[PDB]
Scaffold this active site. Structure first.
Site, short mmCIF file in Angstrom:
data_model
loop_
_atom_site.label_atom_id
_atom_site.label_comp_id
_atom_site.label_asym_id
_atom_site.label_seq_id
_atom_site.Cartn_x
_atom_site.Cartn_y
_atom_site.Cartn_z
N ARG A 97 0.87 -1.18 0.00
CA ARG A 97 0.00 0.00 0.00
C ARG A 97 0.91 1.24 0.00
NH1 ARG A 97 -5.18 1.52 1.45
NH2 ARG A 97 -5.33 3.58 2.50
N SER A 122 -7.09 -1.38 1.37
CA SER A 122 -6.68 -1.84 0.04
C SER A 122 -5.16 -1.97 -0.04
CB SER A 122 -7.15 -0.87 -1.06
OG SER A 122 -8.51 -1.07 -1.41
N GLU A 156 -5.43 -6.00 -6.78
CA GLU A 156 -5.83 -5.47 -5.49
C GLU A 156 -6.11 -6.64 -4.55
OE1 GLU A 156 -9.15 -2.84 -5.74
OE2 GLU A 156 -8.85 -1.94 -3.72
#
Lengths: 185, 365
Positions: A97, A122, A156
């Site tokens: 991230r 995420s 993702e």
């Protein structure tokens, strides 16, 4: 509480945006990994997909993170996403991230410390390009959701609310603060 | 740089290859903001639904029939590498050598008999021809018929099934079509990259469908991220080669999202390694890196196969992987003719490659 009952208030009264999310997400999943699609109900797959839209994300994650009210509707939206996430095979590895944290938040990320966000987190399997901070994340509550996108291109890997991580490594290299998160289940 | 180092160490090192990462979409970027309503990060990303340039398929600039030769090279070369490498399976490097299709090995094979690499590839190829797409349940059923009854074996029996693959079929038999497992790093073995060629042949016109089918085909038995991503990288290498790119273009670094050990292969770190720095174990990262290395350090199909097989250890899997790449690079027509003769079911395998090649769907638009 139905997925449609959950964003009904986020969209024009006519439109049944939960059905649209589900249809697009089913079509993407059919193309990208049809067998993974069979693990999800309409509301599970539509909810995860909705999380990746702009209007969906900015309604959901700020509410879970305490910046806006967490209504019962937003709560049921969250629950559908996580119900869906619970069905997917674990991503066991390392994801990233790339972000920029306020200094007093980065200050709380010390080796030996603990982190637990009320929102979804995420990450992506790819090496991040942007951000003052690169957060490496190891766990296995996080699930790969790229098969719900159109091009299956962004890798993702999505972590659900209140996953707790220990900060097990930290270093600044070139201009970038690297952090290492290990999920503590 | 030793690929077996810890991923924290590799990731700090791999910052020099940040350029190989696709940029976030506008939307994934918002999702990485500390505050999405108050963005902090560059806002230049493209929309999440738009096709990124690394999925723009290069048009094929070689003749179709040259591409066909390379597609046949990829699948027949897989089986060729399989049948030569099995001779030295499990043996210490340089205790014994192979330089012809002689059989033998742990399973006491006749010359030209291939093993689980080719058997699995055949199951995958047959399922594409039947369904016109990647059908994971159909693929598993064919794998089950191979494992339980010796369908698609070179000698009538399943004799060489890998442990991870075995557990997957056992779990699928017990739990049915919705089972997925083998997610742990222990399970990052060879079995999905050594069967990759059919996906790349069928999806030769679409990088995106190659990317989507490559990790999906792996998950039929193997859900370790390093296995899934190694399939995607090999699948891209095969695509570039089948569509006629030189070795230089195909082995140069590509923009694509990969976890750090596959990324380091993409970046070309093997190009600087001596043989005694190359490992040929059953770990998927070792195997993929050794295959790329064997192809980069040879000039013809014959020599790439022999360099890979003589690495020993999991010589079978590295030669089958090298067989896929070298067969795509040099073409079916440059596989030694005596090897084609000895190869079991050689005609059937070349015709499946040809069938996949012609069935390949048009790029999506």
């Amino acid at each position: 509480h139905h997925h449609s009952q959950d964003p009904e208030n986020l969209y024009f009264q006519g439109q049944e945006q939960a059905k649209v999310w589900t249809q697009t997400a089913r079509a993407n999943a059919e193309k990208n990994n049809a067998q993974l699609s069979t693990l999800l109900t309409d509301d599970q797959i539509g909810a995860i997909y909705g999380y990746t839209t702009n209007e969906g994300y900015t309604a959901l994650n700020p509410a879970l993170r305490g910046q806006t009210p967490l209504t019962p509707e937003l709560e049921a939206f969250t629950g559908h996403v996580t119900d869906g996430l619970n069905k997917l095979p674990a991503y066991n590895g390392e994801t990233y991230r790339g972000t920029t944290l306020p200094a007093h938040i980065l200050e709380q990320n010390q080796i030996g410390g603990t982190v637990s966000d009320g929102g979804f987190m995420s990450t992506s399997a790819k090496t991040p390009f942007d951000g003052d901070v690169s957060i490496s994340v190891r766990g296995n509550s996080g699930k790969q959701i790229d098969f719900l996108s159109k091009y299956k291109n962004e890798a993702e890997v999505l972590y659900p609310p209140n996953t707790r991580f220990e900060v097990i490594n930290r270093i600044e290299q070139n201009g970038t603060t690297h952090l290492l998160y290990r999920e503590i289940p | 740089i030793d690929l077996r180092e810890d991923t924290w160490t590799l990731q700090l090192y791999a910052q020099r290859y940040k350029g190989l990462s696709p940029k976030n979409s506008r939307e994934l970027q918002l999702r990485m903001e500390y505050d999405p309503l108050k963005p902090n990060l560059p806002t230049s990303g493209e929309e999440q639904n738009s096709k990124p340039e690394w999925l723009n398929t290069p048009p094929c600039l070689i003749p179709e029939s040259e591409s066909l030769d390379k597609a046949k090279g990829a699948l027949v070369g897989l089986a060729i590498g399989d049948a030569i490498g099995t001779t030295l399976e499990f043996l210490p490097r340089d205790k014994l050598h192979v330089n012809d299709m002689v059989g033998g090995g742990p399973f006491r094979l006749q010359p030209g008999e291939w093993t689980d690499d080719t058997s699995m590839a055949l199951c995958l190829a047959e399922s594409y021809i039947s369904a016109g797409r990647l059908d994971i349940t159909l693929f598993r059923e064919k794998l089950v018929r191979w494992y339980r009854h010796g369908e698609n074996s070179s000698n009538g029996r399943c004799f060489d099934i890998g442990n991870t693959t075995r557990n997957a079929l056992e779990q699928y038999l017990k739990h049915g079509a919705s089972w997925f497992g083998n997610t742990e790093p222990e399970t990052a073995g060879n079995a999905a990259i050594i069967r990759q060629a059919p996906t790349s042949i069928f999806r030769r016109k679409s990088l995106q469908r190659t990317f989507a089918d490559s990790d999906s085909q792996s998950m039929a038995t193997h859900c370790a991220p390093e296995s899934m991503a190694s399939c995607q990288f090999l699948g891209f290498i095969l695509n570039y080669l089948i569509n006629g790119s030189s070795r230089e273009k195909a082995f140069s670094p590509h923009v694509m999202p990969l976890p750090v050990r596959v990324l380091l292969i993409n970046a070309g770190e093997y190009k600087e390694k001596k043989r005694d720095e190359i490992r040929s174990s059953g770990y998927v990262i070792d195997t993929l890196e050794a295959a790329m290395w064997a192809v980069w350090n040879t000039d013809n199909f014959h020599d790439a196969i022999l360099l890979a097989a003589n690495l020993g250890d999991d010589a079978d899997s590295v030669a089958a992987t090298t067989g896929q790449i070298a067969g795509a690079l040099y073409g079916y027509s440059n596989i030694p003719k005596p090897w084609l003769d000895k190869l079991v079911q050689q005609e059937r395998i070349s015709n499946l490659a040809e069938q996949l090649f012609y069935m390949a769907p048009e790029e999506d638009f």
